[PDB]
C-alpha cells in the first residue's frame, strides 16, 4: 500500500542468505560471478588515463553514450554482427548489462505481455518482467541422455518452444552464452528461435554479456546477424565481462532505431547520463582489442585460453569428489550435477519445500569450506522441484584460488 | 503498441533542439548545468587513487553501495541532518540524483497516486511521475511584488498548497535549493511543507543536490531534520554537484528503512550495483571535506564563495543589456526576467503556441551568441502561457567564460 504494486513479488533475493553464511565461515568462494585477479593492464591503464586526462571528462557526456564509446561500439560490433550500426540511433550505453535489460524491459513489456524465458535463466529476467506488468512464460532447456555431461546437450525442444508462443508474446529473452549453464547456442538453435520470432512477430532481447568467454572452439553467434533479425533483436553487452572489470558497470544495447527509440525514452527518464570516465576507459579498451583483433596477443585470444585452463582444472578437481560436472562451452560458469549426493544424503536440514540444492549448498559451506550457487535460483518456482540437483561454480579465478579449492577438496575427499 | 504505455507522453525532450542549434553557432554556453573548469584536486586525485589502487576495486562492490561510501555518507549526513543513519538500512547509492529520483518514484508512485510538483520544477519530475502511473499536481512558486528581483521572494502560498493535497497524494517533490529558480527554502517554508505532509500522511521526496551551493549566508536546511520528518522523507544528494564532477554520476538517497526497503527493491531489479571506483572516489572526497568541515581551506567554504563571485559578476553583466536578474540564494543557476524584450519585441519567429522564452532563447543564440534555457521547460504545459518570460543561466563557469560572455554582451549592448 505505500509501495507501488509493481514491487509485488520481486522483493526477495535468495542470493543474500548465502553471502551472509559464507562470510561467517572460512571459504573458497566460487559462487562469485567475477574475477579475483586484476583486469588486463591495457584496460586498467585505460581507466587511469580517463581520470588523469582532459579535465572535462569529469563533467557530463552525451545522454545516449559517450561518442568515442558509441563510435567504437558501432564499428567493432557492426563488423562482428555484419550490420551497419549508427552510433546515435542503434547504440545505447547503459549501467551494465543489468541496466540494459532493465531499460529493454521497461521499454517493451506492459500489462499482459508475455515474455518467454529459457531455464535455467539469469535470475533477474523474471522480476524485471514482473515489474513491467508482463507474464513470464518458461521453457526448460533439457539435458539429452560417459559420466561427465556437456552444456551443448541441453536441448531447446522445437515443439515445446513453439507452444509457448501466443498472441501475447512480446519478447523472448535469449542469453548466450548461458549463465548459469554455460550453453553456447548453435546456429541451428538460433535459427529455430529466429524463425519463431520472425513468425509471431516478437522481439528477441538477447543478452550476450559472455560473448568473449567461449571454449573448445565453439563460436559465439549473435541472433542479430541472422537474416531479417536485426529488425527485431536487441543485443546486450557488458564491458565488465569483456575486460574482466565487473565493477565498471558499463553495458550497451545494440538495436534497430524503431525499438531503440523507446529504450532511449526509458533511459532519458531514468539515469539520463552514464558516467563519463568509465565510458572513456571502455572505448579505449575496445580500440585496443579491435586493433589486435584475432592476433595472438589480443585479450579475446589469450583470456578464453587462460580460463579454459581454469575450467578444465576445476572440472577435474570437482569430478573426483563425486560432483558430476557439465562441461560448459562458454561463460564464467560450470554447473555440476549433485544427484549422487541427494541419493547418499537425502535428508539435509532446511525449510519444508526448500529445494535440495540450496540445502546442499548451505551444507557444503559449513562443512567443506566451498561456496557454490543453487541452480534452482535460476528456475521458475514450479520447476525448482524437478531441477533441485545442480550447483553453479565460477572458474574465473586465480591459480592461488584453484589451489585453495584443491586443498578444500582433498581434505573433503578423505571421506 | 510495440512500446509499453508507460512511455505515453514522455518521449519528447525540449532540451535537444537547442543543443543542436547552439552547436551550429559560435556561442558562450550558459545553458549547461555544469562546470567547465576542473574539480578540486583532492577529488580528481581521489578518483585517480581508486583506479590505481587495490586491483579488486575493478570488480563488483555491494549492491546498496560501496561501504566506505555508505559509511562516510551515514556519518557526515547523519551529523548534518541530526539523525542516526544506518548505512545499510538508511542509505542507497544510485546513479546520480537522476537515478535516485527514478528509484524513489518507481518505489512509491503507482496508478492513481498524485505527486505535488512545485513550479518551476527540475523537468524530469513530471515524466518520472507519469511513467510510474501517477498524476502530477502542480503548485506555482509566485514572485512577490527595486528592479533586480530575489529568489526568496517567490512564494509558496499556504492556502494554494494545502489545496493540492487530496487523499490520493503519495508524495510531494521538494527541491532545495531550487533549479532553475535558485530559491533556498526557509525554515518556516519547510515547516509549512512538513506540517501538511505530516497531516495528510505523505512522503516528501526531497532533492538537495545543490545543498552546498548557497550564497549570502542563506543556510541549507533539510526537511528531513524537522521534528517527525525523517519517518516520511527521502533525501537525495549527488556527488556531481558536491565536487563539481557531474560526469561521475554518483548519487544517494537517505531515508527511513520502511521506505528505503522499496527503493532497494527497485534498485536490485534495475541496476543492482553502482560502479565501484567512482564510489571510492566520492567516499574519499567526503572524508576530506568532513575532516576540514567549516575550515577556511574546505571546499564547501571556498567554492560557494568563488561561485557567489561568478553569480554577482553575471548578475551585473546581464543586468546592463536589459535582462532583469533574479538573485538566487543558491544552486548553479539564476533566472532573468525578459518581459522588457517581450514588450519591445513581441513577434519573434516560432510555432503557434510556442512560449515566448523558447522563441527568445532561439533568437539570442543566432544573433547575440549566448545560450540560456527557457524557464517554461520547467512548467506544466497549461502554465507555460503565463510563465513564458524567464530564462535560465548557469554562472558556474571559468573567468575566461565570463569574459567571453562580457564580450558577447558588450557587442550586443551597442544597440
Ligand atoms: C547473463 C548475465 N547477463 C547480464 C548480467 C549483468 O551484469 P552487469 O550489469 O555487471 O553487466 C550478468 C551479471 N554479470 C549476467 O551474468
Ligand atoms: C535539481 C536537480 N536534481 C537532480 C539532478 C540530477 O543530476 P545528476 O543525476 O547528475 O546527479 C539535477 C541535474 N544535475 C538537478 O539539477
Curated annotation (Swiss-Prot), chains A, B:
Inhibited by tryptophan, indole-3-pyruvic acid, 3-indolepropionic acid, DL-indole-3-lactic acid, indole-3-acetic acid (IAC), amino-oxyacetate (AOAA), aminooxy-phenylpropionic acid (AOPP) and Tris. GO terms for biological process: biosynthetic process; kynurenine metabolic process; L-kynurenine catabolic process; response to bacterium. Its cofactor is pyridoxal 5'-phosphate. The modification N6-(pyridoxal phosphate)lysine is found at residue 241. One of its GO terms (molecular function) is pyridoxal phosphate binding. Catalyzes the irreversible transamination of the L-tryptophan metabolite L-kynurenine to form kynurenic acid (KA), an intermediate in the tryptophan catabolic pathway which is also a broad spectrum antagonist of the three ionotropic excitatory amino acid receptors among others. Also metabolizes the cysteine conjugates of certain halogenated alkenes and alkanes to form reactive metabolites. Catalyzes the beta-elimination of S-conjugates and Se-conjugates of L-(seleno)cysteine, resulting in the cleavage of the C-S or C-Se bond. Substrate binds at residues 33, 179, 392. Its EC number is 2.6.1.7, 4.4.1.13, 2.6.1.64. It catalyses: L-kynurenine + 2-oxoglutarate = kynurenate + L-glutamate + H2O; 3-phenylpyruvate + L-glutamine = 2-oxoglutaramate + L-phenylalanine; an S-substituted L-cysteine + H2O = a thiol + pyruvate + NH4(+). It is found in: Cytoplasm, Cytosol. This is Kynurenine--oxoglutarate transaminase 1. It comes from Homo sapiens. Keywords: Aminotransferase, Cytoplasm, Lyase, Pyridoxal phosphate, Transferase. InterPro entries: Aminotransferase_I/II_large (IPR004839), Kynurenine-oxoglutarate_AT (IPR051326), PyrdxlP-dep_Trfase (IPR015424), PyrdxlP-dep_Trfase_major (IPR015421), PyrdxlP-dep_Trfase_small (IPR015422). Belongs to the class-I pyridoxal-phosphate-dependent aminotransferase family. Disulfide bonds: none annotated. Pathway: Amino-acid degradation; L-kynurenine degradation; kynurenate from L-kynurenine: step 1/2. GO terms for cellular component: cytoplasm; cytosol; mitochondrion. Homodimer.
